[PDB]
């Protein structure tokens, strides 16, 4: 219970006290108190995982496996730790051991499926979830059905040229989510899945109504906040969207999720907050500097900022000189991206077009530097006049 | 393995005493609100538009 409340410090004391007592009680019924010692040792290992003392957690799980090799849950946590270390190969091996022990275990099959989906290995992953739905005891398993629905949903994020194929995939995803919601009227993810397909179909009002109901039911699904924020951007309610992306980042991610930070940058850009957009994209680029899309968006925001400073004659010499330097940075990045940019995420012709537009603006920007120098010198003259008039009085 | 397979009865004993409240099914469920009636009505409205009615 203390663990469920996050009172890991108290939980450590209670699990240790439980083990020490079971150690004392084994003198009366060694077989039962040893069984208690197994469950309590597993709980203690989960506590060490929650405290991130993963070396002790791994050590306890391996001890349990020395004594009770059929205790499947120890294998799954070892695999989960391997997965979280990013060592998906070892993780798949730990889950396979779990399946060698209980071949129809639904969580082991699901963890392997999630490994394949995390790798975007849609074919193998789908086969792993279908293996769960083929057994009579789990033929209506909502987690597996939702996972298959998500497999279809993930195809919708790719820019698909075949509108009929896109419609067929949308209808498959929606049919699966409808069935899950028919089987389980309380299923949060079935409802969110329906909302996601409706949003992809462009029915943003209806999708908003679905996601709004899901957020009413639970505050702890990160994707529900992202989906709502996306709808706010599409409904041009940028001020609300920016707030939802920032609060989502602060509440659900212990690190900067670059996709969410990019969505925040997109909202700030449509909001016209180019300075905040620039700073947000730089924050994303600091985490993922090799991502050419972040570099492109930075170059674009720099070009827009320079364009604005150069377009408005109110801009002074310090501002215009900074804008010129930023526009040369923009031209430099677009020239590089036109050669090395990721063809699968954006069109290189776009970067080549911006590169040319930057050179075109740079020509006019040099003229504006002279204009700014003249304007600043005129202010210097006015200031000198003001000082001498103060001496006159 | 012959030494592994011999000890499955012990683990079955342990598991009979364990109780887990959050499972693969309950982790997906809302604390009390039912969405089916509301969402199917929304989908019916969308379906009517797709059929041009």
């Amino acid at each position: 219970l203390h663990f469920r409340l996050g009172n890991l410090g108290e939980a450590k004391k209670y699990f240790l006290a439980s083990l020490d007592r079971a150690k004392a009680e084994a003198e009366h019924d060694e077989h039962y108190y040893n069984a208690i010692s197994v469950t309590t040792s597993y709980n203690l290992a989960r506590l060490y995982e929650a405290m991130c003392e993963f070396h002790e957690a791994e050590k306890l799980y391996k001890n349990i496996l020395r004594e009770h090799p059929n205790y499947v849950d120890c294998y799954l946590r070892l695999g989960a730790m391997a997965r979280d270390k990013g060592n998906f190969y070892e993780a798949s091996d730990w889950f396979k051991e779990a399946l060698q022990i209980n071949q129809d275990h639904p969580d082991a099959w699901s963890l392997i499926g999630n490994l394949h989906l995390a790798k975007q290995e849609w074919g193998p992953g789908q086969k792993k979830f279908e293996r769960i739905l083929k057994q009579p005891s789990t033929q209506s398993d909502t987690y597996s059905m939702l996972a298959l629905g998500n497999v279809w949903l993930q195809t919708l994020h790719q820019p698909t040229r075949d509108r009929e194929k896109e419609k067929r995939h949308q209808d498959r995803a929606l049919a699966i989510y409808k069935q899950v919601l028919r089987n389980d009227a309380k299923n949060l993810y079935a409802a969110n899945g329906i909302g996601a397909v409706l949003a992809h179909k462009g029915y943003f009002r209806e999708a908003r109504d679905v996601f709004a109901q899901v957020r009413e039911a639970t505050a702890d699904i990160s994707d529900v906040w992202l989906n709502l924020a996306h709808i706010y951007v599409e409904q041009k309610q940028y001020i609300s969207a920016v707030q939802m992306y920032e609060n989502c980042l602060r509440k659900f991610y212990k690190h900067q999720n670059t996709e969410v930070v990019l969505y925040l940058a997109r909202a700030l850009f449509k909001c016209g907050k180019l300075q905040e957009c620039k700073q947000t994209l730089l924050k994303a680029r600091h985490v993922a500097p090799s991502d050419t899309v972040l570099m492109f968006n930075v170059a674009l925001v720099l070009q827009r900022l320079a364009t604005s400073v150069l377009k408005d004659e109110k801009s002074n010499l310090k501002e215009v000189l900074n804008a010129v330097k930023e526009l040369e940075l923009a031209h430099r990045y677009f020239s590089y991206l036109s050669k090395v940019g990721d063809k699968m995420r954006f069109d290189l012709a776009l970067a080549a077009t911006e590169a040319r537009q930057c050179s075109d603006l740079l020509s006019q920007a040099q003229y504006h530097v002279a204009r700014a120098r003249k304007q600043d010198e005129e202010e210097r003259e006015l200031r000198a006049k003001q000082e001498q008039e103060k001496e006159l009085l | 393995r012959s030494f592994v397979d011999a000890e499955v009865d012990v683990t079955r004993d342990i598991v009979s005493r364990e109780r887990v409240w959050r499972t693969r099914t309950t982790i997906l469920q809302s604390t009390g609100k039912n969405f089916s009636k509301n969402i199917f009505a929304i989908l019916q409205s969308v379906k009517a538009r797709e059929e041009g009615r």
């Binding site: 663990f3 469920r4 939980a11 208690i36 469950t39 309590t40 597993y42 709980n43 989960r46 849950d73 799954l76 969580d107 699901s110 999630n114 987690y143 939702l146 996972a147 998500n150 949903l153 919708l156 994020h157 820019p159 993810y189 969110n192 899945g193 909302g195 996601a196 397909v197 699904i221 990160s222 994707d223 992202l226 989906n227 996306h230 951007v233 996709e259 990019l262 969505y263 940058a265 997109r266 850009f269 449509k270 957009c277 899309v293 492109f296 968006n297 674009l300 995420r345 954006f346 776009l350 077009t353 911006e354 | 364990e18 109780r19 887990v20 409240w21 959050r22 499972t23 693969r24 997906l28």
Partner: peptide, 27 residues
């Protein structure tokens, strides 16, 4: 007419399922 170049960002409506809950076991 050349569409004004927007921020290169594909909006993805996600439905990521939660990790399987291995909560501490009650006795």
């Amino acid at each position: 007419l050349p569409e004004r170049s927007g921020v290169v960002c594909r909006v993805k409506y996600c439905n990521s399922l939660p990790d399987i809950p291995f909560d501490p076991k009650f006795i």
